Structures are given as structure tokens and as C-alpha cells.
Amino acid sequence: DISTLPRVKVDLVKPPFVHAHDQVAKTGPRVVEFTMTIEEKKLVIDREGTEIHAMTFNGSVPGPLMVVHENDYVELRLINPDTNTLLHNIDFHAATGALGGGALTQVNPGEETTLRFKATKPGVFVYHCAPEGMVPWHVTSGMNGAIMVLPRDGLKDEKGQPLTYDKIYYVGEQDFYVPKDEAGNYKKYETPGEAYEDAVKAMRTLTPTHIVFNGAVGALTGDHALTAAVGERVLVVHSQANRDTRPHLIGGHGDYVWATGKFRNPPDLDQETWLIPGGTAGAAFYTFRQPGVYAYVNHNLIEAFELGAAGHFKVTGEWNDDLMTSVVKPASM
Amino acid sequence: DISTLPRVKVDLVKPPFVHAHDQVAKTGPRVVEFTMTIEEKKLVIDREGTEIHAMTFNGSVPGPLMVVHENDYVELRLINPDTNTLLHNIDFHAATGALGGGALTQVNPGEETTLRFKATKPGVFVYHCAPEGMVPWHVTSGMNGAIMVLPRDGLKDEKGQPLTYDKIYYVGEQDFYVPKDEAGNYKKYETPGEAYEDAVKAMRTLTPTHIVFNGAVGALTGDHALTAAVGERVLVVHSQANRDTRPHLIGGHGDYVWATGKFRNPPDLDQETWLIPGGTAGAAFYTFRQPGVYAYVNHNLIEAFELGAAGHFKVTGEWNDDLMTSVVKPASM
Amino acid sequence: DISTLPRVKVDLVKPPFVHAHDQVAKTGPRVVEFTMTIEEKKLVIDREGTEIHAMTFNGSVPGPLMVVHENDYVELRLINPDTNTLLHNIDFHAATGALGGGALTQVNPGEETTLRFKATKPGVFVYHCAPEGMVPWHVTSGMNGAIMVLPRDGLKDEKGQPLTYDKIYYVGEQDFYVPKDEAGNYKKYETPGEAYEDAVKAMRTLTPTHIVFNGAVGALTGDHALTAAVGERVLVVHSQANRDTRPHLIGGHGDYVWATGKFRNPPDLDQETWLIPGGTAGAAFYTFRQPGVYAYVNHNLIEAFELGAAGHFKVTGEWNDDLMTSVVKPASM
Ligand SMILES: [Cu+2]
Ligand SMILES: [Cu+2]
Ligand SMILES: [Cu+2]
Ligand SMILES: [Cu+2]
Ligand SMILES: [Cu+2]
Ligand SMILES: [Cu+2]
């Protein structure tokens, strides 16, 4: 049976970008093959030069977004090169059995493995490393991403009418817990293992030191802001593998939102802000109507503006005065 | 076009009360005009006399609830008198473009401005101050309120049948982060600017020192409890601009609840408790069936009973023994 | 009227197990009688021997799950024996009036009382102790449980088709706040009253020291794991009386989930993780398709793996290679 199915290999891209795919399936079920390489590396996460030992899927935080269709088979080749120091694995919330695949994918440095699972449920799911005994440490070190399982006939609104996006971006939100000394300065370590003991004490406080989008404070700002034009329909996938978040598009809305990200449920309409539970991926669809800069944020404003959970969208087009206008510009009373 | 529309001026009232309005629109689209004055002031928030420098819209925490209908135009005149010390602005989650209006409304002390926006989506939304670089500080100092955009034909249940409330109250929940000395006593400052540096460190802990309804511990209790009678349908609008909350009416339920507050979605039925994400306003409708005192609370009971998130409802009418009755009054075994 | 109704007495069982009942009602409305005895006792909650003074309903944390049908009358006899030291009461979120029954059930040691209330709304609700002035202290000491009010015709899916479970388990999640000394070691006390003052300071930090299922770290693991077989439909009721949680079944899904637990609402489909607000009970239905061990967890992985919020399910049956298979077992590159 599987023997007889067609197979296509897909090369992943760096977040916030997503690999090429079809919204509405043009072929029947296939075996979609992906390859990911584990990369343990130093990453500076803020302006002051704070550095951490990140554990990544393909060198990025978050790992890349995989896109398949309902009932396709996902075949993943996972490589943990000998240059790494730790054992890793992968658990797909999209999969059924063996701890999402975690129990079948344990690889020490120098090993690789190939897992296959059937994508039976449509929606966006989280995938993350989960080694027995060090689960939270690997997850909060940036070792998580997401996979989107699109219905074979694309997305639909609450009335069952088609929703087609022109652009899609993937925003992975990460909570970090950097160990501190007595005065409050962040610690620095030589290898991941040296950090271990302190990492555990830092996590138990339940208070992140940083909460960032795409691995660093300011990662999606300035020259890296997400782009769009007035009239374009944009799908924004957002994941949080360990902690709750509440996305909000400043100056806009989530016209159609699947906060818990499962496509067999009708979406929520006109959301100002929505709650994505830790350990979940959600998706919001919106059509831009005004040009300018928009701030995309986690709406606990301290987490957004003090801790790093903020990104930008710079949109082009003509301003619509019917929607909004300054009647009297700021001036002396 | 707008030139030709009728205009009505509306005078706002102090929360928990709401200005007069029609549920079902009796006229066509209008330009609804409001005026708000910014007031920086000292406020004692608890029993022990803890004082803070509140930044308010119209002198209250939360700012007043504005009520309009879908497709009306909201025209707001914002005044920042010369007696204030800081720059402020306003961002409406209900609006489209320019950061909800934040980028078009920056006024220094002594200035005013007039913004107009079209209310295209029905529901309850949050509005708040959001000056570049000091967003969380202004929001957590009480500078936020809400606006309700009612469908032109009023509220409806999941089956599309009309829901008419007899009373409406607005509950604004506020998380405060008062700076403390080494022993844990709260600090006091002369002006808002003197507090700034410490405020930022207090917020980063992510742990509020107080969480209150209507600006103070006990604000909605005793002589200030909300009132109703058995048989009255009450709509309770609740907002939280920065942090999640989970409202609950002790001894009652939320018969119809729009937890994320957007009226084009059918409401959730018979809720015991519901989650309102930080940066959102929600609404719950209930019909009183029993008389007596009810406690309205944020259901993290530590936040409610230790931190200040608790209010009362005292309802009049006849007791119904079919619903509840004490068969054997407390007595010695 | 009530005089004329039939009455059945039901003996409760220890969580995670549930007392015998009918899903679809075979008789008409009845007066269902229950008896609960309050038990103040020492409980060691972790591996290191940390001990607390738990306040329980029937000797367990959580208290037992009561199951009735919509429109039955619940008659509870509550006994607070003279061996206890504190005043207690009970508030049912399922009931209407008198603070859920809290104001009608105050019993000092040596007293008992009998309350009756009509179960007008279907769903799973939380019930908990709530004495004026010490509400959070009694709740966070383990004094809470849940009650399920089933529709007279059983559970249904979003299309109104019947959902019948073969097994049902009750998982009560508890956040504990154990006082610590300067070095971080947990304190020990002789009686509940001796703990009081310190308990209040510990709770105000808003950071639990332990978050457990069924009263202790590891309570639902090893020889106590929940059991099932491939093909069995399992309903898992989960409650959290004070704090938000986000359940997740590792290696599985929530096929039908009522996150806020009210049965008149259609369930959410294919959830990976769902949010249950503090002060609420929810229910998830799932059909096992793969054998093996599954970890049932609160998906903030620090709370799950560091703090104690983790349990197991060991399921029997044949492995399905179509759903999942290891194509290449972990080996040297
Ligand atoms: Cu790993
Ligand atoms: Cu997971
Ligand atoms: Cu301001
Ligand atoms: Cu905002
Ligand atoms: Cu008690
Ligand atoms: Cu309660």
C-alpha cells in the first residue's frame, strides 16, 4: 500500500518563512519526506549580549514549519551529528502513539533515525524534543517548532465557504529562563551541561527572563518586519510549546481565528485578542485594509514591551479615511 | 457623506455605570461624539492607605464605557490639560489602522486632538493609552477602559433569538505593581516621573501587588455593591487590558457568555467560570433567580481574596426553595 | 412534590475512580442522596517527604466525583466530626443561590447539616469549601472536588449523535504553596492553625511549590497508572479550583473536548491541548488507537515535570503500523 504511494521530498525554510505548498490538494495522498539536523549552538538573545546554549531543529528557534495535507504520511529523517553533546528526540502532537514519536526517535550524537506517521487530523500542531528526564530543559532551550495539516480542500469560514491566503508567516514564541547571579546579572556557560543545574532552578521560579519571537528580542523588527499590502489575505501561524500567550495585531484584528488551531472546528470571528494555551499552535487569518506599521504582540504588555514578545508588520497601500481619520491634529488647546 | 450624517453628543458616566443608549438601533448610522479629559492623580488603592499615581481617562479607573452601534462613526475629542506632566494617547482595539489610533493621538500637556473611526465590528473592545516606550507603564497605572459596539438589532442567543438586558454594569479589572522596599513595605512618590525607574523593575517580576475592580480593594462592596432584583436580566461587561482573568458569579452562572466578547459569534451557555485573555473585554448575561448576596470574583481565589479582585451583588426578591433549601440546619451531630 | 419523588442513596468512591451510574437516564427525576465526612489530615506530597495539613472531603484530594442527571435533586449530608479543628462549608458551582450553598452549610467540629439543591444545568462543575475570610486557604489545602450533571439522554457530539464512554476517570489537579525557610527548605507544622500565618504569605507570591494530580507527585504513575485498551472510549474529567491548567495526552488527542465543561455547548474537535480556567471542571473524550504508555500532563512542562503535574495511562492492544512506524531504528550515521 504505502509502497505504491507517490513520494515527494521537501526542503524546509527558515522561520518566519514557510516552504512552498498547495492549499487545496492537487494530487492524492503521498508520503512527504523531510530531513532535519539537530544543532546545539550559542545564541545571543538580546541587545545587551545575553548568550544562551540553544538546542535547535535545523539551526533555528523555532524549528521550521512543515506543511502536509490530511491523510498524507510524514516521513522524517532526524540526524543528531557527532558535534552535538546531548541525546535528543522528537514528539509530534500531530501523531498518534509512542509519545508522539518520542519513544521511537532517541538519537545520541552520531546517530540518525527515520520515523513515519499518518496525518489523520487537520490543524496546526506543535512538535518538540522530549527526552525522558530533561523535557522542559530541551523545550525551553528553543527545541520546538510546528506542523500544519491542511484539509485536502483548503481552509473554510464558519459557513463552509473557502478561505484562501496570499501570504503565510510562522511566528514561534519562546519563553527563556536565563540563570542569574545575586545582583541580577545573567550567567554565561561554556557547554550545555555546565548550565544544567542552574537551568533547573531558574525554571522552577516559573518566571521567564525573556519571551521572544523568532529567537531574539527584536528578531521581527526593523529590516525584518513581516510585510504585506492593503488587500492581501494573510495567515499567521503562532505556536507556544510551554506557556500561554495571547496574540494581538495592533491596529488590526483576527477576522477568522482558530485559537486552539484545529481546522474541523469553525473559526472565531473578529477577535481583538485570543488565548493560545501553552503546548498548542493556533492560526489567525486577516485582510489588510490600512497601510502603515502594525505591532504584532503577546498582549500581556509587560511580556511584550519589557520582555521581548513584539514584532512588526509594515504594510503598503492607500490610506482609507472612511475607516479612520484625524479630524483635528494634536495642537495647543 | 459623513457631512450629511446626523450627530449626537453623549456625556459619559462613572463606572460601573453606563451612559444611556438604545439596544436596538432606532435611527440609522450617526457620528457619535465623545469628549475625554486625561487626569493624572493620586489614588489610594487599599485599606492600609497604599497610594499610587494613577493615569486616567476622565478621572476614573477604568475609564468610562462608550456605547455605539455597528457602522456608526466614533468621534472623540481628547484633552490633555497643562496640569498633567506626561504625554498620552489612545489606542482603540475597536478601530482599524494607525495602531488603533495611537499614532494619531499623541498629546503633550496643554494639547488636544480629535480622532474619528468607523465601528465596523460588533462586540466589546478594550481601549488604552499606548505611548512609544512607556506602554505597559501607562496601562498598568489604570489608563484603560472599554467600548461596546452593539449590533444594529441588539443581542441574540445561539439560535438567533433576541436577548434584552434590563441592567448593564461595567467592571474594569486592574493589575497594579507597587514598588516595595527590602522589608516589603510599599514605596510612595511625589510625582509620576519619580516612580518610573522603580515601576519598571516592579513590572518585570510579572507578579501584581494588587488586582482590583473599579480602582480599589473593596470598591464594589458594602454601599457600592451592584444591585438587581429576582427576574432581572443583567449584562456584565468585564475588561482586562494586560492580564488574564477568569470571572465567576458565586451562587450564579453566566447563562450566555461571550468570553472573548465578539457578538458575531454565538455565546457559550451555562458557564461556571470563563477565561478573558489579557488585552480583551468580554460580556456575560444572566437572569437572577434567587435573592441575597452574590460575590463576583476573579476565580484564582488568591487574586480574589488576598489581592483585591472581588465585588458584590445584593439582589432583592423571594427565595425559591425548589432551587435550593437547607433540609437540616447546622447542628450538633 | 419532592415528597413524592423516588430516592436513591449512593456511596462515593476514591478518585480517580467514579461511582456506578447510568449515562442515559433509565428513570425519571429523583432525589439523589450523598454523605460526606470532612477529614483534616497530614499528607506527604512528594518523594522527599514534604508534609502538609490537608483539608479534605471524605479523606481524599480531590474530594470524590458526584454524578447525577439534569433536574434531579442533590441532597447532601455534610459531617464535620469533633476530631477536626476548623469550621468548613461547601459551595457547589452547580447550584443556584446562597453562594452555591456556602452560606447554608457552615459547620464547626461536631456539627452536621443537610443541603438540597436542584441540578438545573448539565455539565461538570467544581465544588469547594469557602468559609468567610479563609477561602483560598481551604481551597489550596485540597478542599475541593467536582460534580457531573449529565443530560438525561447522555452525551452527544457536535452533530447531535450519541457519545458513549466505556470508562471514566476523574483527575483533580491541585496547586500547593508550602512555606519555606530562608534557604528554601519547606516548613513543617503541628496543627493547621500553626501554619496559617505562613500559608497566607506563601500564597501571595502566586507561585505554587507543587502542582499535583490526585494529591501527590507520582500519584497516578507506576502501579497507579490509569488503564485502558485499544478501542475503548474514555471520558476524562479534569478540575482545577484555583488556577488555570492546560491538559494534554502525550501520544493522543482530545477527540471531543468541553474545555469549560458545559454540555449544552457542542464540543471542540481534535484538540492537542485545551485550557481549563481556574475555578472550572472540563471533560475530554478519546478513543485509544495505539497500545503503550501515554503521559497525561498539564502542558506547561515545568509544572508537569518539575512540579508534579504528570500522570500515566498504560493501554493494551495491537500496534498499528499504518498510524506510526519506525522506518529506520536509531543507529550510527
Ligand atoms: Cu533535545
Ligand atoms: Cu508536548
Ligand atoms: Cu497615558
Ligand atoms: Cu492593546
Ligand atoms: Cu474547609
Ligand atoms: Cu468557586
Side-chain angles (χ1 to χ4, degrees):
Chain A
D1 196 80
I2 307 305
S3 14
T4 289
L5 288 179
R7 310 164 81 86
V8 54
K9 171 76 209 297
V10 28
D11 293 286
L12 295 304
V13 292
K14 245 101 187 73
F17 308 98
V18 184
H19 76 253
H21 55 96
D22 298 309
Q23 292 178 44
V24 175
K26 259 66 263 283
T27 63
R30 300 180 290 197
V31 174
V32 186
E33 305 171 341
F34 299 95
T35 295
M36 284 198 299
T37 297
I38 300 167
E39 236 233 297
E40 284 170 21
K41 64 197 197 98
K42 274 205 279 274
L43 219 190
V44 337
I45 56 177
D46 63 28
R47 290 134 158 151
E48 288 76 21
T50 299
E51 211 172 31
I52 97 179
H53 277 89
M55 300 177 198
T56 75
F57 282 116
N58 257 23
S60 62
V61 174
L65 189 71
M66 290 157 84
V67 181
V68 298
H69 287 274
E70 186 182 336
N71 291 148
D72 277 344
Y73 289 78
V74 177
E75 210 177 89
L76 178 80
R77 179 181 175 214
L78 184 61
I79 305 155
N80 183 3
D82 54 295
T83 46
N84 290 325
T85 63
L86 308 162
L87 169 105
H88 300 281
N89 68 353
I90 191 159
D91 160 13
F92 281 92
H93 287 186
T96 304
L99 272 17
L104 268 23
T105 56
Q106 286 148 49
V107 285
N108 290 298
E111 301 187 333
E112 66 172 75
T113 189
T114 298
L115 177 82
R116 176 171 67 237
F117 76 89
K118 194 170 179 190
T120 62
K121 295 175 180 288
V124 273
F125 300 82
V126 160
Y127 69 66
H128 63 82
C129 178
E132 180 62 39
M134 50 197 150
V135 178
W137 186 42
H138 288 231
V139 175
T140 60
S141 292
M143 209 159 177
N144 58 87
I147 176 169
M148 184 168 61
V149 177
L150 286 163
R152 299 206 54 255
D153 55 343
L155 293 176
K156 301 306 205 300
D157 59 25
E158 300 69 52
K159 315 187 313 81
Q161 190 107 293
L163 288 179
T164 301
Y165 50 89
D166 298 301
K167 281 188 163 60
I168 180 182
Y169 289 111
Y170 172 40
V171 180
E173 177 171 347
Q174 185 66 60
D175 47 321
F176 286 129
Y177 304 77
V178 190
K180 294 191 289 287
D181 63 15
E182 282 177 71
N185 304 298
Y186 297 121
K187 263 99 113 50
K188 193 91 54 232
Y189 306 92
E190 242 59 45
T191 64
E194 193 189 329
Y196 187 58
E197 311 292 343
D198 287 349
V200 180
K201 174 202 175 86
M203 292 186 273
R204 301 179 74 83
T205 73
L206 268 30
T207 309
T209 55
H210 302 72
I211 297 171
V212 300
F213 290 160
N214 225 239
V217 173
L220 301 179
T221 61
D223 270 297
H224 303 288
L226 306 174
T227 58
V230 168
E232 283 192 312
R233 300 101 105 203
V234 180
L235 179 76
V236 183
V237 173
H238 193 127
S239 68
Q240 227 301 5
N242 190 68
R243 186 174 155 99
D244 303 327
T245 178
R246 51 213 63 74
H248 175 87
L249 180 58
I250 307 184
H253 299 85
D255 294 323
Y256 301 97
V257 178
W258 287 266
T260 54
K262 305 301 166 285
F263 307 136
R264 275 179 45 147
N265 298 289
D268 255 88
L269 288 170
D270 309 323
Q271 303 294 279
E272 63 186 301
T273 302
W274 49 98
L275 192 299
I276 291 174
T280 321
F285 186 109
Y286 182 59
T287 299
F288 282 97
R289 282 151 243 156
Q290 292 276 44
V293 175
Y294 288 72
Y296 181 71
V297 303
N298 163 338
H299 214 290
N300 175 122
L301 304 165
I302 300 169
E303 299 177 6
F305 297 105
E306 294 304 323
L307 278 46
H312 287 339
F313 260 96
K314 285 152 193 149
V315 179
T316 57
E318 188 181 14
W319 181 263
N320 186 344
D321 280 307
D322 192 52
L323 252 28
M324 181 175 299
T325 187
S326 191
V327 190
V328 177
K329 300 291 287 176
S332 286
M333 272 130 79
Chain B
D1 196 80
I2 307 305
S3 14
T4 289
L5 288 179
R7 310 164 81 86
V8 54
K9 171 76 209 297
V10 28
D11 293 286
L12 295 304
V13 292
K14 245 101 187 73
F17 308 98
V18 184
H19 76 253
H21 55 96
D22 298 309
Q23 292 178 44
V24 175
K26 259 66 263 283
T27 63
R30 300 180 290 197
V31 174
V32 186
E33 305 171 341
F34 299 95
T35 295
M36 284 198 299
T37 297
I38 300 167
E39 236 233 297
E40 284 170 21
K41 64 197 197 98
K42 274 205 279 274
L43 219 190
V44 337
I45 56 177
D46 63 28
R47 290 134 158 151
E48 288 76 21
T50 299
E51 211 172 31
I52 97 179
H53 277 89
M55 300 177 198
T56 75
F57 282 116
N58 257 23
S60 62
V61 174
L65 189 71
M66 290 157 84
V67 181
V68 298
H69 287 274
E70 186 182 336
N71 291 148
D72 277 344
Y73 289 78
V74 177
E75 210 177 89
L76 178 80
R77 179 181 175 214
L78 184 61
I79 305 155
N80 183 3
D82 54 295
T83 46
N84 290 325
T85 63
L86 308 162
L87 169 105
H88 300 281
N89 68 353
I90 191 159
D91 160 13
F92 281 92
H93 287 186
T96 304
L99 272 17
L104 268 23
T105 56
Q106 286 148 49
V107 285
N108 290 298
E111 301 187 333
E112 66 172 75
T113 189
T114 298
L115 177 82
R116 176 171 67 237
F117 76 89
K118 194 170 179 190
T120 62
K121 295 175 180 288
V124 273
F125 300 82
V126 160
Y127 69 66
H128 63 82
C129 178
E132 180 62 39
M134 50 197 150
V135 178
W137 186 42
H138 288 231
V139 175
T140 60
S141 292
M143 209 159 177
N144 58 87
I147 176 169
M148 184 168 61
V149 177
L150 286 163
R152 299 206 54 255
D153 55 343
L155 293 176
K156 301 306 205 300
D157 59 25
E158 300 69 52
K159 315 187 313 81
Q161 190 107 293
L163 288 179
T164 301
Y165 50 89
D166 298 301
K167 281 188 163 60
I168 180 182
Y169 289 111
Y170 172 40
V171 180
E173 177 171 347
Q174 185 66 60
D175 47 321
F176 286 129
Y177 304 77
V178 190
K180 294 191 289 287
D181 63 15
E182 282 177 71
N185 304 298
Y186 297 121
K187 263 99 113 50
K188 193 91 54 232
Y189 306 92
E190 242 59 45
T191 64
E194 193 189 329
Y196 187 58
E197 311 292 343
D198 287 349
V200 180
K201 174 202 175 86
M203 292 186 273
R204 301 179 74 83
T205 73
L206 268 30
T207 309
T209 55
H210 302 72
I211 297 171
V212 300
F213 290 160
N214 225 239
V217 173
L220 301 179
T221 61
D223 270 297
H224 303 288
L226 306 174
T227 58
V230 168
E232 283 192 312
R233 300 101 105 203
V234 180
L235 179 76
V236 183
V237 173
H238 193 127
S239 68
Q240 227 301 5
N242 190 68
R243 186 174 155 99
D244 303 327
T245 178
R246 51 213 63 74
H248 175 87
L249 180 58
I250 307 184
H253 299 85
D255 294 323
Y256 301 97
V257 178
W258 287 266
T260 54
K262 305 301 166 285
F263 307 136
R264 275 179 45 147
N265 298 289
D268 255 88
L269 288 170
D270 309 323
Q271 303 294 279
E272 63 186 301
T273 302
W274 49 98
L275 192 299
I276 291 174
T280 321
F285 186 109
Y286 182 59
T287 299
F288 282 97
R289 282 151 243 156
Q290 292 276 44
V293 175
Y294 288 72
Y296 181 71
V297 303
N298 163 338
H299 214 290
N300 175 122
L301 304 165
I302 300 169
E303 299 177 6
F305 297 105
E306 294 304 323
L307 278 46
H312 287 339
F313 260 96
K314 285 152 193 149
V315 179
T316 57
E318 188 181 14
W319 181 263
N320 186 344
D321 280 307
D322 192 52
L323 252 28
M324 181 175 299
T325 187
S326 191
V327 190
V328 177
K329 300 291 287 176
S332 286
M333 272 130 79
Chain C
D1 196 80
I2 307 305
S3 14
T4 289
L5 288 179
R7 310 164 81 86
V8 54
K9 171 76 209 297
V10 28
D11 293 286
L12 295 304
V13 292
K14 245 101 187 73
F17 308 98
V18 184
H19 76 253
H21 55 96
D22 298 309
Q23 292 178 44
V24 175
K26 259 66 263 283
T27 63
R30 300 180 290 197
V31 174
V32 186
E33 305 171 341
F34 299 95
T35 295
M36 284 198 299
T37 297
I38 300 167
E39 236 233 297
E40 284 170 21
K41 64 197 197 98
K42 274 205 279 274
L43 219 190
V44 337
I45 56 177
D46 63 28
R47 290 134 158 151
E48 288 76 21
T50 299
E51 211 172 31
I52 97 179
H53 277 89
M55 300 177 198
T56 75
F57 282 116
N58 257 23
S60 62
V61 174
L65 189 71
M66 290 157 84
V67 181
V68 298
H69 287 274
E70 186 182 336
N71 291 148
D72 277 344
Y73 289 78
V74 177
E75 210 177 89
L76 178 80
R77 179 181 175 214
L78 184 61
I79 305 155
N80 183 3
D82 54 295
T83 46
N84 290 325
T85 63
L86 308 162
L87 169 105
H88 300 281
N89 68 353
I90 191 159
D91 160 13
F92 281 92
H93 287 186
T96 304
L99 272 17
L104 268 23
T105 56
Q106 286 148 49
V107 285
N108 290 298
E111 301 187 333
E112 66 172 75
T113 189
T114 298
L115 177 82
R116 176 171 67 237
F117 76 89
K118 194 170 179 190
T120 62
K121 295 175 180 288
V124 273
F125 300 82
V126 160
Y127 69 66
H128 63 82
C129 178
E132 180 62 39
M134 50 197 150
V135 178
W137 186 42
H138 288 231
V139 175
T140 60
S141 292
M143 209 159 177
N144 58 87
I147 176 169
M148 184 168 61
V149 177
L150 286 163
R152 299 206 54 255
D153 55 343
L155 293 176
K156 301 306 205 300
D157 59 25
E158 300 69 52
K159 315 187 313 81
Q161 190 107 293
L163 288 179
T164 301
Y165 50 89
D166 298 301
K167 281 188 163 60
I168 180 182
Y169 289 111
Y170 172 40
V171 180
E173 177 171 347
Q174 185 66 60
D175 47 321
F176 286 129
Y177 304 77
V178 190
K180 294 191 289 287
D181 63 15
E182 282 177 71
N185 304 298
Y186 297 121
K187 263 99 113 50
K188 193 91 54 232
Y189 306 92
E190 242 59 45
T191 64
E194 193 189 329
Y196 187 58
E197 311 292 343
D198 287 349
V200 180
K201 174 202 175 86
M203 292 186 273
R204 301 179 74 83
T205 73
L206 268 30
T207 309
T209 55
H210 302 72
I211 297 171
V212 300
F213 290 160
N214 225 239
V217 173
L220 301 179
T221 61
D223 270 297
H224 303 288
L226 306 174
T227 58
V230 168
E232 283 192 312
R233 300 101 105 203
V234 180
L235 179 76
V236 183
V237 173
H238 193 127
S239 68
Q240 227 301 5
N242 190 68
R243 186 174 155 99
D244 303 327
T245 178
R246 51 213 63 74
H248 175 87
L249 180 58
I250 307 184
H253 299 85
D255 294 323
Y256 301 97
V257 178
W258 287 266
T260 54
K262 305 301 166 285
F263 307 136
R264 275 179 45 147
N265 298 289
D268 255 88
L269 288 170
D270 309 323
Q271 303 294 279
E272 63 186 301
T273 302
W274 49 98
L275 192 299
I276 291 174
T280 321
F285 186 109
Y286 182 59
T287 299
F288 282 97
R289 282 151 243 156
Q290 292 276 44
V293 175
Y294 288 72
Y296 181 71
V297 303
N298 163 338
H299 214 290
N300 175 122
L301 304 165
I302 300 169
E303 299 177 6
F305 297 105
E306 294 304 323
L307 278 46
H312 287 339
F313 260 96
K314 285 152 193 149
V315 179
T316 57
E318 188 181 14
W319 181 263
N320 186 344
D321 280 307
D322 192 52
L323 252 28
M324 181 175 299
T325 187
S326 191
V327 190
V328 177
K329 300 291 287 176
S332 286
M333 272 130 79

